[PDB]
Design a protein around this ligand. Sequence first.
Ligand SMILES: Nc1ncnc2c1ncn2[C@@H]1O[C@H](COP(=O)(O)OP(=O)(O)OP(=O)(O)O)[C@@H](O)[C@H]1O
Ligand SMILES: [Mg+2]
Lengths: 51, 385, 48, 49
Amino acid sequence: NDKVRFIKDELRLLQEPGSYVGEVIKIVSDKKVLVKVQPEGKYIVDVAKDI
Amino acid sequence: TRCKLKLLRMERIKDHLLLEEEFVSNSEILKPFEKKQEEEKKQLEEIRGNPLSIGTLEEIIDDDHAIVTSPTMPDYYVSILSFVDKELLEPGCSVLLHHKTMSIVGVLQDDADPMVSVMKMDKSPTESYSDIGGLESQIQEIKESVELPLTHPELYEEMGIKPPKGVILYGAPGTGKTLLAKAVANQTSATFLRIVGSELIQKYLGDGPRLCRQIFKVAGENAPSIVFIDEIDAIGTKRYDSNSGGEREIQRTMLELLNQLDGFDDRGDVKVIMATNKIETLDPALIRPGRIDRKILFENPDLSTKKKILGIHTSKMNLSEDVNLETLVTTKDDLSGADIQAMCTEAGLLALRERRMQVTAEDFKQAKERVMKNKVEENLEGLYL
Amino acid sequence: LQSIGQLIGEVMKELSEEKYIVKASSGPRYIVGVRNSVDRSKLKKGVR
Amino acid sequence: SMSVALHRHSNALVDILPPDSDSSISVMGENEKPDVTYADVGGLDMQKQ
Ligand SMILES: Nc1ncnc2c1ncn2[C@@H]1O[C@H](COP(=O)(O)OP(=O)(O)OP(=O)(O)O)[C@@H](O)[C@H]1O
Ligand SMILES: [Mg+2]
């Protein structure tokens, strides 16, 4: 039961889509931050529920 | 004791009072959100969304539209929308575009860039006049040009000639022109922008010139101003490769700067400081002699000058009671203040090596030996003998 | 119209008999499979 | 840091590659010398040693 469950849970992470990676340049006044996405351009984007 | 007590009195009441007033106000604001406010904030979210892509506003077309250029390679014809209008915008400002369907949904940047942050400074310079001490005659060419029309432009009007316009710091390394630029701008009482011209070089296209343009816009808001473009020599004329290039953008940047010298209105209120190693490290294509005014020629400290410079350094240096200033000056011949700076530091290193607190006269000779070492010339007695 | 175009690369390196490193003209390097139809005797490194 | 495989449509790390991969080809011909041996040499016997 532990083993079969894990092999399926890692598969579930693959199927659901990618991620990227930025660095916060500054904080803006709508509760969003100015990120520079390192391999592309900038995007201004909302905080998490843990952040 | 009592001088403490009085300051203590004032500083506690002002800080503390303020904290309590801020602390209450965050609640007093949030409780009512009825009527105008809720409506306003709600509309602004709806027109917007998430994520928002940075943009730049190239121009406005007079039909409530605009031409914008994105960080992605495409450029786009968009509608002007939201609370931000074309009256509230101005060209060359960074603007928020909604990702899915490109339209200006707002602004929060308001022309804030990582180049804009480095250029900004509206505070007084760090060095004051004769920190920077001495090259007095050199200051007595920079001050004439830079301080004087800002202070009273009147003088030139009564004289009956056009005011000065810019200065070109050029000539010897190691005279501190990169420091000197600071010294003067303090004295005048004016705002001091500082930007390194190496950061106006970009491998992206049309970006080079945008960065040059931001400088004069800022300069005009905070006028009177002295703008230091540090190292115009570093735009230079250089080339990265000639088989994959890099030497196109250099020209377009150099050009955008020659135009706003005169072309940002005939004013000595938009002063420039151009520091350069020599003029033949620049693009040889140039604006005429009076447009840049006086070219300020730095040369080697003479015997008197390097006493001054040396003296500054050694006061800072601790535990040198066995050193006499004059004798250092006797043995040495004319040299930059740069090499005096090194000799004093090499002399701490030697005395730290030895493990002895004191710094001797004898010590200093060893440091002279090290600095002078590879300057040797035997064709001096090749001609003389 | 029903046959459709095809993509060119070059065998960048042989990974396996049945796996090849190709470098696409479009852009990205790929690991591809080998069809029944193409024989592995034809496949080798550096061939188009 | 070395080369690795990512899925085409899942865009994730599913599989690993040797670092040997994605580097210069090693002899563009076949590796070894054609029928030419120490017999064919004819030199230079010492220096070949
Ligand atoms: N007038 C001065 N009084 C005190 N110290 C000085 C003075 N002039 C120069 N120095 C010293 O020498 C150092 C070298 O000067 P600086 O860095 O400004 O050089 P520069 O002439 O701009 O050269 P480059 O050609 O590399 O731009 C200063 O950092 C300072 O320590
Ligand atoms: Mg300098």
